[PDB]
Symmetry: C5
Subunit: 375 residues, 5 copies
């Protein structure tokens, strides 16, 4: 009875076009805040933050006022989109194909004219995502809100601290905080300044999954590439091991090409580890080729340079703690004996080249080890 | 004739803004339930439950009442969106880009004013999906509904048991149950409390497909990695087998990277099996390198430590139940004979190193076997 | 002139809320059919059938009647959405995020009041897709239509045979038929029953592409895995061949993981062939390891069990149709001669182990062959 | 002043429901054409053509006429959706989830009543895409337009040649032409016939990218598979080369599985080349196994069939232009000498088997070469 | 008070259909510019530029004028969509499924009637993307705006320089500039010309990420393929190395198939490097097969052509700075001695073929090196 009467009286001559101030020369104060409910998604490749947010807007409407003695029990009223003046506050840096993602709900007005408006929405905002320090990276995503067509002379936007009481923690992003800052800006469009409120959502990535999926595979690849230096050359498998470890690395590069977020803005420090490991694997293949040249050296070819015969077989080697008819028959047997004694000599020469390969092989083992550590 | 007359009389002075109570100071009771029809999708990566649901809302409208003797045959009427007051009940934890997924249908009103409203819809809700015990995991997805702008003083939400009579079983998720609980909450926005009804959909994953696609490949990989310990060293293929099994493991890691749902919140126990198998494969490659060092040992290098000559060739070995001119011609032949007798000695020394490799090879076979069992 | 006059007269006092019957106590008959134009997509993973359909609804409207002598030439009229009463017939088992996919068109009404309404639309419906017999699988997808808010007492839904004259054959699904069945159901919501019409679209998959992309690769993999039993052991490549065939199998498992539709409801019989082939490949690798143990057996180790010396070298082998100073010099030469005669003996022992490997190798060839056939 | 007056006079009693003809018994002529601006996408897998098109509709409206002496300067007027009668022309074979993709713009009307209406839109149409001759394939995609609810007695659709002056060439599809044909069809719905205009867009694929990404890899794979026949058997790598070439082929099959469009309707002739190359690779692996059996033949096993000793070592070989105490000491030395003379004989027998392998190896080289050519 | 009065007076007799000019014969000038805020995405495969833009339109409305002495404090007013005449300026080359992506906001009008309208929007435009010089490629994407239904006689479009003060730099595309050009075009539709304003957005790709992900892998592949020429032939692994490097190349071709943008219009010069590297790898495999034929040559087969014995062993080799009873016993020993002396001769012949392989091996090393440089 009284709710009906009030609803009929309130709209008499009301104009949703009119900014509802008593004095036209004065600006209308609008308090703007928001409630952060959940960080739905952080799109690194598209540079888009998705959030579930309840916007909070409050203003006084001069015309929507009533004495609650003449309408007993009617302490508030509600108006849908289009029947009440509302601030046209938009998210400036929206990434939504519709640009305005707010779901339009009721404005709640009490008897002194105070208008409350809390539209929810899944908001997409354009956020510059810096993955230089990925996975230990902190992102500052700005949410810039402001009246689109009401400037500072007409709509005095004011900020209130963002609400996080209802926040639901994300399983990948730790909410550091959501500070806000009201600014008064000028635009080439207009001589009048347009205030805005910007909420910076500071997020801290929880790195566990990434440290478990991206870093241990590099240690296992590097380790399996460094086992080539322990594999004997007689096996005939050093190249198989090293080249197959590199093929596995390439497959893991496909995986990394998917798991790791790339935005092309910088060079994630983490990727200097992927590079260190690809270079250690390729250089262990190059050094396995050098060791194989040493091991398979031709005994009838060149002679081992005295230079290397002392650099490796002596110095490095020590540092590694490594160590008539009767006469006709005589000529026939002597040939055989000397043939034997000559292949034996060639086998000894071969044994030094085979030994040098072992020494070079272990030196590379230790050298490659320390290099991994520092990197 | 009477349907027309009733439809004309009912809207006379009706106001869809008015909460349709007789006494304004009193709250309006709204019974809220839902019918679960189908669980369409459980998005683990986006943390979104998709369901086909029929919402059920019922209230009494004081103005929509008629005597069915003055309108014979007209026992009910129907009103579309915008011509009747309706509760503004939303899904709070919506993940829909539109936020309100309900398809708006007719409100059915009978002659005493009872309003029934069963809007259908494909509802997306944000659900925390815990895959710690995947594939034997149970998910509790909350559906929180409540009036957006009507608080507890105006709209007394009441719950009724959810309907599952029409449910269609999912081929991947067993519906344990959908209990509900009405709560009365406070929000920083407002001093008035806002009741809500929350339906918790408890689902139990049917693990067959996952146990068939993800677990047997790990047993086949582990088994093929443990066949390296039975492959003879003379073959010259132990490294080829082990390293290729690891390459196949990496490809299977791509597959697992797709089939398995990862949400980065925890560490699926199942993944401790993927880790156990990758470690068994890498350690069988390391132990194959050690066996190859033993087998390919240089007979003219070091001597087999008595320590190991007893630890392996004796103890482990037993535990495994393993086992003038004429004189010038004489000198020539003696050299040849002694050369033979010296290579033979070196061949025997080599045979112990080749034997030790076999013993170490089988010990690793049994050791690796028991390790798999416990893990 | 007459079209204008008729359009003005027809809407005078018309109410799109009124079910357009003359007697209010009687139900309104609505004939419902559809024209199937094209089966756009069969989503096995999401369990969604997409179709292009023209719905067909016909009823009589008591008020939309005119004498075509007073409006010469005006034999029909057309009304858009919102200006005429229309049945609210929805697809119950919709999978569309909007839930109602019908494109709203004109209702065509002739002079006796007969209303025709053929809205087109791209309809998504939830269909249980059973791939047990994939690719020779037949799917029965239900399309359940019914009035949402008009029960059997108000709207007497009646069915007419579906139209397929305009159907455009799909390149992957053969339309067996689209039978319909009108049912009268009860729901927990309501004591009144709600009739519905359900069209079951029966589809038969055209299996060519699948038989060409999924089955021949398994025959080629199995064949290349069985060529290991013909490869000699001296080559030193049996393991390379078998393990690389298994790696190729894993890559083909990625392909199958994409081409093959999996819905987790059952276990496609076809997949018992994928399992048979993976098991034949892994068991040919295990049997190649056994053959290699036989071939590389140590002549100074154990002795070939008489048991196997008769089981293989005799029985299986036959079944396969397989087959002073002078004296000092004497001692020196005798040693050499006996050394030769002793390695020769050891070479013969080795030749039986090498022979046994060949016999086991071919037995496995034939055994593995018959196993493939039956599977 | 005059524009305002005309706009007020024109809508007086206007009815957007009225087909705007002077005589009601007569049909209204509507000229229909379109401007093709760009072929946006040809979806082979979903069988959907996407185009940017400007529809062109023209008709005369009897009521929208004015004398341009009483409204000086006002030579045309414009009306938005809903304030003027418009033809309800739809794309019958739409693949758009909304079914009507036209963006609704102004109708331009001049002083004699001629209505022009050029709505733009991104149109999705269902097109049967035949990839039998891919990449040299020509597609005929139909665009069927017609009035949905106005039959031939009410709306006389007429065609005009499609406009391509503004067309922007596609980088993948050459526009052969867009002929049109007006048809008068009957439907089971209705006894009245419904005319339609169908524009067939004929496209010719520009095959460069496909010939560069899909065909050369098959020539390189086939060539690398045929280098196995030139690799010596002593290398011990023929199987490694052939089986790894097949593994690379499988990876390339993944690539082809993505680049190549498959619609399951036919069997792209191009794919007979993919099959020819997979079969040449598998058969070169089979023939490498046969060559290896020849090369590794056991000298103490069977004897080379005279049959093959003449077929290969002679005929094919020629066609390829290929080619007391003292006595005790005597017995000891004679044994050694005869042992030598016996292994030598066995080495010669081995050399024929090794020679035969070379002859078979080259015959397969030439045979496989000619086979590639014809295929 | 005055805002209300003005809003009531301004709409009295206003007609949003009327182009708001004082003289009807004259055209209305509309200034059109835009503010570029962010280049959201450059879709090379779909040929679509996505941008966040604020359109800027300004015109004078003759009717929306008031004296600001009779409405003190009211210096501007605002009108939403549908209550004021607005230019119907569309993006001609839109790629949006809705075709008009502009979010409709208020028109701001001051007291002399000047209308300002700055609708924001996420605009999709069809842009021809030329990747011939990728990654050092510059794209010119046109944005063609114009009145759809107002020709040059009614709406005199005029251009103003685009605004970039608010631009936010993209992490992948450097904004060179956004020049504009107003054109007056004719269309087959209409005899009247339709002016348009086209803004060409010139972008310069920042190539770092691409040079790091696509080019270094080709240098590492080419280098690992050229290490086969340093690997000794005795290792028995040249083919394993080369063929596995090619397999890794194929995997990298999958990666390139994803990272690299292909539009099929041209042939990216960069891809001539991918071709150079695939050809160097395949030709090093072919030359490794030739070297293996040389190394494994049969000493009892043909003789080394004098031609090659001088071309390689001399010329190239030098350029590379590379280098009774008693008598019966005599016959027995002589045989053995001569057998030895004959295998030795055959070993020397083999050593020249093994030497020639080394010379050919290094020549190919240097030849392949210079070829890489030039390419
Ligand atoms: C730490 C190593 C370098 C690392 C950095 C990479 C640098 C380049 C890589 C490897 C370089 C390795 C050194 C060269 C090989 C040694 C050959 C030699 O000693 O003599 C040979 C010279 O043969 C040549 O011409 C060698 C120089 C050509 C190298 C070209 C690089 C190709 C690999 C690219 C791979 C890039 C790496 C991939 C990265 C992921 C022959 O001579 P000799 O017969 O031995 O001499 C005795 C003869 N005498 C008795 C008659 C006197
Ligand atoms: C052109 C070839 C066929 C091509 C078409 C494919 C057909 C099938 C493929 C290959 C067949 C190749 C011919 C058989 C091998 C020769 C063996 C032989 O000669 O004798 C052996 C017989 O051993 C057998 O039992 C051979 C028959 C079994 C073949 C089963 C096919 C498995 C491979 C599936 C791969 C499928 C292909 C993959 C396609 C991508 C043993 O006898 P022997 O000791 O040599 O004889 C002398 C002994 N004597 C002195 C006591 C008398
Ligand atoms: C620079 C090389 C070419 C490069 C371009 C590619 C061209 C083609 C590739 C390679 C060609 C390499 C040359 C041929 C091999 C040498 C054989 C030879 O000398 O004699 C053999 C002839 O055997 C033949 O029939 C050889 C010709 C067939 C080649 C077919 C190409 C297959 C590979 C496709 C791969 C494509 C490449 C892949 C590209 C990524 C046998 O004769 P001989 O016993 O040695 O002679 C002495 C006997 N005598 C004593 C009785 C007199
Ligand atoms: Cl007002 C109203 C809405 C929906 C219904 C339900 C009864 C049948 C089954 C679902 C729906 N149609 C009943 N009444």
């Amino acid at each position: 009875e009284f709710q009906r009467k009030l609803y009929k009286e309130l709209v008499k001559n009301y104009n949703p076009l009119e900014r509802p101030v008593a004095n036209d020369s004065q600006p209308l104060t609008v308090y703007f805040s928001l409630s952060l409910l959940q960080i739905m998604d952080v799109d690194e490749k598209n540079q888009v933050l998705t959030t579930n947010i309840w916007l909070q807007m409050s203003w006084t409407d001069h015309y929507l006022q009533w004495n609650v003695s003449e309408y007993p029990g009617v302490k508030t009223v509600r108006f849908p989109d289009g029947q009440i003046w509302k601030p046209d506050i938009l998210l400036y840096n929206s990434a939504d194909e519709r640009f305005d993602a707010t779901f339009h709900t009721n404005v709640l007005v009490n008897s002194s004219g105070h208008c409350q408006y809390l539209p929810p929405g899944i908001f997409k905002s354009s956020c510059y995502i810096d993955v230089r320090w990925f996975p230990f990276d902190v992102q500052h995503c700005k949410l810039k809100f402001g009246s689109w067509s009401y400037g500072g002379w007409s709509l005095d936007l004011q900020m209130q601290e963002a609400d996080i009481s209802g926040y639901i923690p994300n399983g990948e992003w730790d909410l550091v905080g959501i500070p806000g800052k009201r600014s008064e800006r000028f635009y080439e469009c207009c001589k009048e300044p347009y205030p805005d409120v910007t909420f910076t959502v500071t997020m801290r990535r929880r790195t566990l999954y990434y440290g478990l999926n991206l870093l241990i595979p590099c240690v296992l690849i590097s380790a399996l590439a460094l086992l080539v230096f322990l594999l004997p050359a007689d096996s005939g498998e050093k190249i198989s091991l090293g080249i197959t470890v590199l093929l596995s690395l390439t497959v893991f590069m496909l995986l990394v090409a998917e798991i790791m977020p790339a935005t092309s803005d910088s060079v994630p420090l983490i990727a200097q580890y992927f590079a260190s490991t690809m270079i250690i694997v390729g250089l262990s293949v190059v050094v396995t080729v050098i060791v194989l040249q040493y091991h398979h050296h031709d005994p009838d070819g060149g002679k081992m340079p005295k230079w290397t015969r002392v650099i490796l077989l002596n110095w490095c080697a020590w540092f590694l703690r490594m160590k008539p008819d009767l006469a006709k028959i005589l000529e026939e047997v002597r040939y055989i004996a000397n043939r034997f004694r000559c292949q034996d000599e060639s086998e000894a020469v071969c044994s030094e080249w085979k030994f040098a390969a072992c020494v070079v092989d272990r030196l590379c083992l230790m050298a490659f080890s320390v290099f991994t550590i520092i990197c």
